[PDB]
């Protein structure tokens, strides 16, 4: 008896990372990506919005950027295949720092994995208008 | 470098200045150097 | 406690915003400081005012005070460190703005000054490091004293013009 599905609605959203503390920005994205206000509201399928992120490079981090915040990618058979970057050390690929916080707060299933396809991260400001040919409604964090 | 896990005063010259997460010493006599790591 | 700041002659202090820019005759200095700590002119001279009187602010009080007191001194009086070479055949020349020292090392040592500091040699056993920024002057004369520190047996190496060196003696 409860309400069924409609999909012919893909909503694009622009979110700015500038000065926002990672986890707190992550929460917002991860929530709009799954379903917060939720269109049909059902969990059986992907109802969430598409989230474009700008200024990925300027995301904020508290007591540790150079310290403690350590990404820990541990490669093929561990013939000491234990690679690790610091968070300051993500002056290499900053578009990943947002990505790994967001996927981290998303379901881990078949559908869950299909969700990262909706997160588009970019390190710049006025220039990231790449994946910005469709709609691009701007949503500020809090 | 004389690593004594207990840095206490020995004479009226010793100075206990807190640095990079440890109990250090900057005394007058070079032998009197005490650190906890 | 630290409060009075003497601002003589041609001083152009502009503590507007977070850019507490202090201009003068010797050269124009730029130095950033805390926003939660107040600073401007409340009379003839200068004063730094702290709001909170707990512990965290008292440390930053004496910090900001002495730092502008050093930038002001720099724009009028300036700064000059006087270093003395000690030891057999230890001598320093000059190759432009570069300090060419000969201090018992197989190949001579060359030090290039940064944009704002100047090297001087009166007698070739005396080095003068003169500049605008006390930090940079300290940080530079620091590197020269490091080329050869006074050893604990014969005091040989770079020492300050009036520096005292205790001596051990082995044999």
């Amino acid at each position: 008896k409860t309400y069924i599905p409609k999909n012919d609605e893909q909503n694009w959203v622009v979110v700015d990372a500038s000065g926002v503390p990672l986890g707190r920005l992550a929460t917002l994205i991860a929530s709009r990506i799954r379903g917060k206000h939720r269109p049909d509201f059902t969990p059986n399928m992907i109802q969430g919005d598409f989230v474009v992120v700008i200024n990925a490079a300027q995301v904020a981090l508290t007591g540790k950027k150079l310290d403690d915040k350590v990404y820990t990618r541990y490669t093929g058979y561990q013939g000491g295949l234990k690679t690790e970057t610091a968070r300051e050390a993500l002056s290499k690929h900053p578009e990943r720092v947002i990505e790994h916080a967001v996927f981290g707060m998303l379901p881990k299933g078949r559908q869950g994995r299909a969700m990262h396809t909706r997160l588009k991260v970019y390190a710049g400001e006025t220039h990231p208008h790449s994946a910005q040919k469709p709609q691009v409604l701007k949503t500020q964090p809090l | 470098m004389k690593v004594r896990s207990s840095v206490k005063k020995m004479c009226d010259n010793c100075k206990v200045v807190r640095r990079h997460g440890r109990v250090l010493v900057i005394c007058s006599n070079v032998k009197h150097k005490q650190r906890q790591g | 406690g630290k409060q009075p700041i003497a601002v003589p002659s041609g001083v152009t202090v502009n503590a507007q915003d977070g850019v507490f820019k202090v201009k003068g005759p010797k050269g124009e200095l730029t130095v950033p400081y805390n926003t939660e700590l107040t600073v401007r002119q409340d009379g003839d001279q200068l004063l730094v005012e702290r709001p909170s009187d707990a512990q965290k602010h008292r440390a930053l009080h004496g910090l900001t005070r002495t730092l502008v007191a050093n930038a002001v001194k720099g724009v009028s009086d300036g700064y000059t460190i006087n270093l003395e070479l000690r030891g057999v055949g230890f001598r320093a020349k000059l190759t432009g703005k570069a300090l060419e020292m000969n201090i018992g090392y197989s190949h001579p040592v060359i030090i290039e000054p940064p944009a704002g500091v100047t090297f001087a040699v009166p007698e070739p056993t005396r080095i003068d490091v003169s500049g605008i920024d006390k930090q940079l002057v300290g940080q530079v004369a620091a590197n020269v004293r490091k080329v050869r520190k006074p050893d604990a047996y014969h005091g040989k190496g770079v020492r300050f013009v009036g520096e005292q060196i205790a001596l051990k003696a082995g044999k």
């Binding site: 093929g76 058979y77 561990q78 013939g79 295949l81 | - | -």
Partner: protein
């Protein structure tokens, strides 16, 4: 940086002063410039050079156009050389000089499937004190119940050779341009009548 394509000709004995030098005769033939790659068009800076002449009949339409766009006349081999520009069409003259240390790279003569002894050095086993595992056979592939796995990367029997090998800092002994030849001290990888790539020393000593 600087570079050329050639064909390994062979090895001989030469003398310079009184010292006998083992030389590798290489034909670093003319290499027409076939495509220039710029940051503006290709996203990076490089040059596409070509090596052995191909009969026009043997060349297909897609390759005909690509060669025609530069007015070259079909090669057969096409290689890129990064951060290399010099105008015209690449030959060894002034590209290389007698004495220059170079990095000659080829494709090692392939030796098919090879046991852990030949391929990895191994040690095999006793020829006599009671075997079954006489000479080649690796030992123990792992441990016991802990890593129920065998380590990834484990040195085992496989296809040996037929690989890219860059031999560093080879000395340039002689150069006969017009004869389009270049003598190199030592041994270059790959078999005679094979493709070699002579480049300016990757990181010279």
């Amino acid at each position: 940086m600087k570079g050329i394509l050639g064909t390994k000709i062979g090895m001989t004995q030469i003398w310079k002063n009184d010292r006998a030098i083992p030389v590798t005769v290489v034909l670093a033939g003319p290499c027409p410039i076939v495509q220039r790659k710029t940051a503006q068009t290709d996203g990076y800076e490089a040059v596409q050079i070509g090596y052995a002449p191909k009969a026009e009949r043997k060349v297909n339409k897609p390759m005909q156009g690509h060669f025609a766009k530069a007015g070259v006349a079909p090669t057969r081999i096409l290689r890129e050389f990064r951060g290399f520009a010099p105008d015209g069409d690449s030959v060894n003259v002034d590209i290389f000089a007698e004495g220059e240390k170079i990095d000659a790279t080829g494709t090692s003569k392939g030796k098919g499937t090879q046991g852990v002894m030949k391929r990895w050095n191994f040690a095999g086993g006793p020829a006599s004190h009671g075997s079954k595992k006489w000479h080649r056979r690796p030992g123990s592939i792992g441990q016991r119940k802990t890593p129920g796995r065998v380590y990834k990367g484990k040195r085992m029997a496989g296809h040996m050779g037929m690989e890219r090998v860059t031999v560093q800092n080879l000395e340039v002994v002689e150069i006969r341009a017009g004869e389009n030849l270049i003598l190199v001290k030592g041994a270059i990888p790959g078999a005679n009548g094979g493709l070699v790539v002579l480049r300016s020393a990757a990181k010279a000593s």
